Amino acid sequence: GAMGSMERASLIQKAKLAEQAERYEDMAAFMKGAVEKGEELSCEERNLLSVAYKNVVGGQRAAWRVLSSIEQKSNEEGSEEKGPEVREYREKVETELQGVCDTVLGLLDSHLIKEAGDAESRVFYLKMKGDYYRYLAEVATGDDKKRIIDSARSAYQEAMDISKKEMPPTNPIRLGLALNFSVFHYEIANSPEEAISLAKTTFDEAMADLHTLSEDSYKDSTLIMQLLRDNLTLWT
Template sequence: MLLSAAKTRRKILFRMAKLAAEAKRYDHMLRFMKEIVEATDPDKDLSPKERCLLGAAFKNFLGVPRHSHLSTAAKTSSWLDNFTGPIAASYLLTSKMEICRACAEIVQLIDCRLLPTTVSNESKVFYLTLKGDVSWYMAEVKGALDGMGDEAIANSAYAEAWGMVTNLDSMNLHRLAFEFSVADHFLNFRNSPVDAFAVVDRALNLQAINSPEIRPAVSLLTFEGGLQLTANLLNLRQRLKNALEIKAPESPDHQICRPATLPAIP
């Protein structure tokens, strides 16, 4: 009876989280998803749909504050006079602390509650990807010097996940999300569109996907968001290709050179 009541509560919270997402109330969405984690047996992992909604809650909750902070920092960088300079610095510090507190909470939840209970490579890749994403978000708002530790955490999480994606279907939702996140990391944090293009191009290598060694892309149909992620990767690839061709017109054949140091996604 108790198990049934807990299961019913999780279903209600899940529906409320989806409703909050439709209403774009991401603070409510995140609160409901945290309650789902609390209502889940400590020895059990979340369901695939719950995992995806939890990740969406965190990233949507962080999205607007993060971009607003970066935009405000860029716009106020020239405010050097005695009156407006300290005002901008004080506001940006408050904003940075709020973002970092939210990011640190996510990393702690992943390390202490979510990763220890997961057994599948799929779940591990998902949680490590989310950990990598929020860690470089934190490094991004902290700056090059203060964010070095968080950058190292992001790199470590991505590297660990990178070693696990070989066991996932080439069109698996979590693998596609991982590849998109790594490309986003290279492009917007490391400022390396060449590396970003190499990741996206390999993820969309249809010849490799259709080879006999690769299992059929069943998960493209069975996981929500797979088609959208593929479309996002295709769009990102085209934008990167256009940007790189414009950036390096002196190349005689306009070929995009890939860095030899970038590990190939299997």
């Protein structure tokens, strides 16, 4: 770890600076260094970690989709052979994406999840584990694709079970987990009905618990509820 000589607090400070500068690769490297100090992460620190890698892998996914699209067109009936370059470069981006996912999954496995006992940390990390297996699933095509999908499903399911036992239905982590697990069902597991059912049930159970919330908590919960509705509108 090239961050091994930097103070934990300095790594966290620099992650926040990197965020302000929209330097998300740096942000992720700083937060990886912080995780590798071995201490548990606070709520703010967990979100710094997730923001950083979400931005990095999000850009990789967008690039992969562009390149995969070009590659599919190059392979349709009527196309002029352009050689191996599109496939090679898509593979290059894909391998870098898989590397980032493996890095995040490695941090969760060593040893963030095993030390996470509170629902807010444990559900957060298991959601991340589902998310990064989901991103691996998006590009998977080999002997391992079903197993990658089942790893995502298993992580999401454990997170779901904890969240339903330990968090209110408006908890934004619970809502965001359900949002993403619903997308997993629709886009990865070829289970659009499960996706729609989960989004709708999550939305309705949250709606009924909004009356308990402060104005600030209401704003946080209704924001994610609107994303659930947005997806439901996309899918029906």
